[PDB]
Amino acid sequence: AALSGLTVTGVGYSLEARLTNINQLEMGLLIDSDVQKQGFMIPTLPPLVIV
Amino acid sequence: QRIGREIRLTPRYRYFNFLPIMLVINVINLEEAIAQRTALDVNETQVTPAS
Numbered sequence: 001a002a003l004s005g006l007t008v009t010g011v012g013y014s015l016e017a018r019l020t021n022i023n024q025l026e027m028g029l030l031i032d033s034d035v036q037k038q039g040f041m042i043p044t045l046p047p048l049v050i051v
Numbered sequence: 052q053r054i055g056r057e058i059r060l061t062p063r064y065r066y067f068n069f070l071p072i073m074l075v076i077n078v079i080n081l082e083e084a085i086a087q088r089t090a091l092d093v094n095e096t097q098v099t100p101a102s
Contacts, residue, residue: 023054 021053023052025052
């Protein structure tokens with residue numbers, strides 16, 4: 001009774017394929033380097049004195 | 052944007068024609084004549100008065 005009305009059919013499919021080219025036409029992941037340089041400088045402070 | 056090795060031939064020639072003389076013969080029904088009995092077409096000189 002629970003299976004009354006059950007019909008099962010296959011609709012479609014998906015297929016995995018990889019394009020192994022021996023010459024290849026992809027650009028991968030580009031690798032670079034950049035330089036960030038900082039400037040740190042040191043001032044004076046108010047004076048102290050005894051008279 | 053592909054990589055491959057190729058081998059090429061460069062053909063160079065020409066056929067010229069000088070002599071304006073030549074003959075051709077056509078052969079037909081060669082097999083049938085030897086396949087079947089053939090003999091002796093007579094020019095029967097029709098002496099049975101009709102000519």
